[PDB]
Design an enzyme around this catalytic site. Structure first.
Site, PDB file in Angstrom:
ATOM      1  N   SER A   1       0.910  -1.412   0.105  1.00 47.33           N
ATOM      2  CA  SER A   1      -0.018  -0.109  -0.022  1.00 47.33           C
ATOM      3  C   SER A   1       0.974   1.141   0.155  1.00 47.33           C
ATOM      4  CB  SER A   1      -0.817  -0.011   1.060  1.00 47.33           C
ATOM      5  OG  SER A   1      -2.177   0.782   0.980  1.00 47.33           O
TER       6      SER A   1
ATOM      7  N   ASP B   1       4.920  10.613  16.012  1.00 50.41           N
ATOM      8  CA  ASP B   1       4.849   9.086  15.826  1.00 50.41           C
ATOM      9  C   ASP B   1       6.164   8.234  16.163  1.00 50.41           C
ATOM     10  OD1 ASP B   1       3.124   6.627  15.175  1.00 50.41           O
ATOM     11  OD2 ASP B   1       3.786   6.642  13.068  1.00 50.41           O
TER      12      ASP B   1
END
Ligand SMILES: *CCC(=O)N1CC[C@@H](Oc2n[nH]c3ncc(-c4cn(-c5c(F)ccc(NS(=O)(=O)c6cccc(-c7ccccc7)c6)c5F)nn4)cc23)C1
EC number: 2.7.11.25
Length: 291
Positions: free
Chosen positions: A19, A126
């Site tokens: 992806s 993150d």
């Protein structure tokens, strides 16, 4: 912006899942260099600003793939894998306190660079052990530091990231650089315990626990106070009460001059068979806390 032809690369294997945001390992044939390549569904020209970042503890930019429909970012490939894969292997049994300190200094110094030393302030949002990699010489490198600003498709699953997210990040609240400090303390705790934080739980339960009940990861009672208190400051619900990475760096300096800490820490590190039950007990008390 170096340009890298799609045909200049030899693709080996994909992490992620094919992806957008998935990372390939690849060989750069023009340069005979092993590389990482992130599949993006296009490239923002304005993203040049980040191409100028350079620090031994952040992954190194190489170039961009600009052949529609193939769009990618190319970076160095760190030979020894992710911090995550290493911590949760039996290889982490070789970790002494000098090892922990070096690696925690590596991450703290790379974060200090992104926060205060680079052409543009970068708050990562993150940071986590799956986003830190190990170069051939043990040097750690922070990945994905430009994702929260430009390619927000790479991150969000996001259920697998709650153990590392600051509360204010979980609530989508106002966010400061000290959200990266909270995530770092989880990385530290991972290095000390070599456990999967909140292992087995539901993301929404962890999100809930961290945010309403001020739940934090079990610190074993036999962990050296210096490490325990560093974890605590990094985990303050009130982001303004968490240390900056300059202070963390200075804290690790003090710890590494404490003549008593190495025996205390190495003792604790190698007695995991005693105190692992403390973390595992809290895990069932939290799982049973939804049933
Ligand atoms: C599949 C299981 C798994 O998770 N793993 C198996 C092994 C391990 O993978 C490894 N092992 N070594 C590795 N070394 C590096 C990486 C890696 C590199 N990247 C990657 C990219 F491919 C692209 C970008 C980033 N980060 S970034 O987006 O913040 C960035 C950095 C520098 C410049 C720019 C930029 C420049 C111009 C315009 C926009 C942005 C962006 C990145 F981290 N991911 N993983 C994996 C390894 C783990």
């Amino acid at each position: 912006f170096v340009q890298i032809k799609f045909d200049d690369l030899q693709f080996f294997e994909n992490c992620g899942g094919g992806s957008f945001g998935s990372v390939y390992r690849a060989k750069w044939i023009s340069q005979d260099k092993e590389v990482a390549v992130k599949k993006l569904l296009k490239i923002e020209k304005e993203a040049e600003i980040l191409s100028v970042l350079s620090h031994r503890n952040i992954i190194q930019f190489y170039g961009v793939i600009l052949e529609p429909p193939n769009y990618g970012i190319v970076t160095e490939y760190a030979s020894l894998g992710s911090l995550y894969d290493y911590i949760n292997s039996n290889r982490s049994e070789e970790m002494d306190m000098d090892h922990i300190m070096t690696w925690a200094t590596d991450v703290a110094k790379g974060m200090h660079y992104l926060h205060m030393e680079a052409p543009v302030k970068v708050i990562h949002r993150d940071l986590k052990s799956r986003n830190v990699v190990i170069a051939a010489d043990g040097v750690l490198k922070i990945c994905d530091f430009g994702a929260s600003r430009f390619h927000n498709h790479t991150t969000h699953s996001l259920v697998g990231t709650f153990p590392w997210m600051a509360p204010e990040v979980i609530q989508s609240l106002p966010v400061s650089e000290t959200c990266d400090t909270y995530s770092y303390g989880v990385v530290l705790w991972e290095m000390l315990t070599r456990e999967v934080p909140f292992k087995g739980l539901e993301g929404l339960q962890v999100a809930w626990l961290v945010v309403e009940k001020n739940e934090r990861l079990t610190i074993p009672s036999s962990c050296p106070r210096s490490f325990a208190e560093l974890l605590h400051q990094c985990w303050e619900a009130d982001a303004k009460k968490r240390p900056s990475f300059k202070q963390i760096i200075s804290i690790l300096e003090s710890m590494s001059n404490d003549t008593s800490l190495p025996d205390k820490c190495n003792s604790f590190l190698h007695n995991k068979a005693e105190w692992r039950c403390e973390i595992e007990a809290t895990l069932e008390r939290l799982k049973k806390l939804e049933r």
